[PDB]
Amino acid sequence: MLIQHVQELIGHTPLMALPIEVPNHSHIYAKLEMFNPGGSIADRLGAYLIEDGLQRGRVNAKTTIIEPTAGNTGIGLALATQAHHLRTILVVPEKFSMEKQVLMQALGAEIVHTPSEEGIKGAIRKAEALAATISNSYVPMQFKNPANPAAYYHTLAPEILADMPAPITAFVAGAGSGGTFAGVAAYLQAQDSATKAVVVEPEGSILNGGPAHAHRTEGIGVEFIPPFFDQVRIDQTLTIADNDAFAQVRHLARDHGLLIGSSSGAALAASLQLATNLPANSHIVTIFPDSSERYLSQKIYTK
Amino acid sequence: MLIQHVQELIGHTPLMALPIEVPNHSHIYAKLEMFNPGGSIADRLGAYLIEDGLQRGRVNAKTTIIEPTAGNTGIGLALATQAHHLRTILVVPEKFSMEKQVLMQALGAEIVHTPSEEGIKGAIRKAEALAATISNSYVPMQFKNPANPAAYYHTLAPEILADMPAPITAFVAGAGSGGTFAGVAAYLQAQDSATKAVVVEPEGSILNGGPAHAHRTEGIGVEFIPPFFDQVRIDQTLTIADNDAFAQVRHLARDHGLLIGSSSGAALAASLQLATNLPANSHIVTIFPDSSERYLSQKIYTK
Ligand SMILES: CSCC[C@H](/N=C/c1c(COP(=O)(O)O)cnc(C)c1O)C(=O)O
Numbered sequence: 114m115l116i117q118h119v120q121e122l123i124g125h126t127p128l129m130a131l132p133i134e135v136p137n138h139s140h141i142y143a144k145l146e147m148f149n150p151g152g153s154i155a156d157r158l159g160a161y162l163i164e165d166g167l168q169r170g171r172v173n174a175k176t177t178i179i180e181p182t183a184g185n186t187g188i189g190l191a192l193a194t195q196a197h198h199l200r201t202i203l204v205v206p207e208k209f210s211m212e213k214q215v216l217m218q219a220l221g222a223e224i225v226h227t228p229s230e231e232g233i234k235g236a237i238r239k240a241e242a243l244a245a246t247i248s249n250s251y252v253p254m255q256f257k258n259p260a261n262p263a264a265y266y267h268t269l270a271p272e273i274l275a276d277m278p279a280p281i282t283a284f285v286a287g288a289g290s291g292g293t294f295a296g297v298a299a300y301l302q303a304q305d306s307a308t309k310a311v312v313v314e315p316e317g318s319i320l321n322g323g324p325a326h327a328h329r330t331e332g333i334g335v336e337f338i339p340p341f342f343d344q345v346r347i348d349q350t351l352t353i354a355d356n357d358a359f360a361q362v363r364h365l366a367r368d369h370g371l372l373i374g375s376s377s378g379a380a381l382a383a384s385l386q387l388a389t390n391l392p393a394n395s396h397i398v399t400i401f402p403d404s405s406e407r408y409l410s411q412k413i414y415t416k
Numbered sequence: 417m418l419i420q421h422v423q424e425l426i427g428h429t430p431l432m433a434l435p436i437e438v439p440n441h442s443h444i445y446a447k448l449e450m451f452n453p454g455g456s457i458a459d460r461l462g463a464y465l466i467e468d469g470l471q472r473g474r475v476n477a478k479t480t481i482i483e484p485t486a487g488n489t490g491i492g493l494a495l496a497t498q499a500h501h502l503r504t505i506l507v508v509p510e511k512f513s514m515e516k517q518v519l520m521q522a523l524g525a526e527i528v529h530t531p532s533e534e535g536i537k538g539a540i541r542k543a544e545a546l547a548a549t550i551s552n553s554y555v556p557m558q559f560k561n562p563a564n565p566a567a568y569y570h571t572l573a574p575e576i577l578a579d580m581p582a583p584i585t586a587f588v589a590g591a592g593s594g595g596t597f598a599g600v601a602a603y604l605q606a607q608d609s610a611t612k613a614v615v616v617e618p619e620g621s622i623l624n625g626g627p628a629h630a631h632r633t634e635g636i637g638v639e640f641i642p643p644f645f646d647q648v649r650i651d652q653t654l655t656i657a658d659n660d661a662f663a664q665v666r667h668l669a670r671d672h673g674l675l676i677g678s679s680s681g682a683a684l685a686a687s688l689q690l691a692t693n694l695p696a697n698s699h700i701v702t703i704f705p706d707s708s709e710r711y712l713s714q715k716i717y718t719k
């Protein structure tokens with residue numbers, strides 16, 4: 114394949130039939146989003162948000178994009194903005210992966226650091242605050258903007274179907290902003306009412322009423338129920354334990370050469386769990402958002 | 417694309433015509449080998465090496481593979497040996513990228529650390545010594561084994577020609593083992609004598625008689641002149657400065673969303689340099705062996 118710009122490599126990621134032991138002898142399919150130029154499923158979102166921002170006449174040549182992110186979206190966004198020569202300011206909460214930040218910076222963005230404890234909420238508050246002091250500015254707001262799920266709706270979703278060798282029994286996915294799950298579940302359920310949708314979250318997330326605290330799994334986890342969920346018939350909301358997610362990261366890497374992040378491990382943990390209360394010979398599809406190489410600074414592969 | 421195992425992702429890497437300013441208004445094409453499952457062009461060698469090892473009846477189910485690597489070859493070899501249930505011991509000099517080491521152990525290899533000052537030469541001596549204490553063992557020996565250049569000869573080389581939109585004026589490549597350069601130059605020069613072959617080494621490397629010292633650029637650099645060089649007519653040997661390599665690593669990421677390792681920077685450095693003693697409108701092809709995300713622990717993006 115011959116490419117001119119890096120943006121061409123966004124999407125069209127492989128779908129792998131994990132050569133692993135699945136209960137009731139069913140099959141789990143994962144989309145290796147880490148093969149995106151920026152190394153995360155977020156690359157898609159980023160390009161799309163900026164596109165939407167342009168088409169809606171809310172962004173121009175000298176506009177200053179400001180957005181709260183945990184890092185991966187910041188990367189996907191910085192890549193897009195970089196392509197359009199758009200000044201970028203990313204607001205990210207203090208304790209997230211060093212590499213994401215270095216990468217964000219490396220791609221040309223300017224990071225604003227909010228207190229670890231304030232989480233995404235503080236980052237969002239801070240982004241909007243700054244947006245109000247910068248006249249020519251646009252805040253994509255990936256946690257509310259509908260363009261978010263719309264993004265995965267026309268790219269990811271169709272791509273999953275195209276590779277699937279059979280009817281998708283269920284679709285498990287991790288949720289950070291929710292965008293990925295929603296936008297894809299939306300498309301899949303609207304092509305087969307049967308496809309059950311399942312959201313996954315780390316212990317310490319609110320999606321299941323649990324108490325709100327900090328988790329070791331990174332990338333997923335919510336601090337308020339995501340607005341993009343009324344477009345999907347949520348068949349079940351699973352809360353995966355930290356050790357469970359990481360244990361999977363370790364295994365997949367040691368037994369099937371799969372370098373996957375925690376969010377990806379949590380997804381696999383969830384998908385394998387759902388496999389038990391599902392008909393035999395079923396067909397589950399899930400998403401691995403990024404590589405474990407992105408969390409090597411956190412000793413991801415340690416116990 | 418639907419895949420069964422990760423090994424199916426090795427190779428068929430994109431060829432990018434870098435959207436950058438070039439001397440004499442020529443063009444530089446780079447093969448983004450960081451898109452391999454293991455994140456490096458080494459994935460190729462690792463597979464081929466073990467493959468050759470089997471066909472030559474030098475490897476069996478219970479054999480212990482021992483190889484001196486700087487990390488990448490080790491990762492690719494770990495993948496391949498993991499695929500055949502082969503025990504792996506990788507001898508790597510002390511000061512190479514941490515991530516490479518983590519990945520190597522996470523993939524299942526066992527690392528043996530040689531002194532940083534002894535370099536690859538200390539790594540080789542140690543490999544061979546260990547190899548002689550283990551009866552059923554095979555040392556692929558990427559620095560001497562002809563399977564090395566051969567591996568890229570039938571994969572990488574053809575791949576380049578496949579996408580190249582015009583005759584290749586010259587092919588610039590970094591050298592660590594020599595393999596990649598020799599292998600690809602060999603094929604290319606035998607498909608067009610006009611195609612010039614240029615090797616690239618970091619300051620501190622012996623190719624140009626320089627004094628032998630430690631360099632910041634990682635992945636390339638030789639401590640003896642690689643034997644695979646008699647198969648190619650070396651048209652020029654460029655020794656690239658550390659700052660030069662890294663300055664490119666910085667630029668491509670801040671201007672064209674390209675996350676590249678130092679080895680890929682020295683490469684671009686040398687390629688652009690050559691564009692100045694080459695006809696106008698020329699066509700140069702080079703190779704970016706791995707991502708910058710692999711040297712984040714080393715502050716790759718810092719000045
Ligand atoms: C915690 S919050 C965060 C958000 C995003 N992410 C995100 C993510 C996910 C989810 O996805 P969504 O669309 O749902 O958000 C997964 N994984 C991973 C790794 C990631 O990073 C960013 O980055 O900004």
Ligand SMILES: CSCC[C@H](/N=C/c1c(COP(=O)(O)O)cnc(C)c1O)C(=O)O
Nearest residue numbers: 485486488489592593594595596635679705
């Ligand atoms: C002494 S040097 C070392 C060798 C290998 N590498 C290698 C490499 C290169 C070169 O390639 P070659 O085939 O020539 O060796 C580049 N880059 C990168 C990143 C890398 O890692 C290993 O790893 O072991």
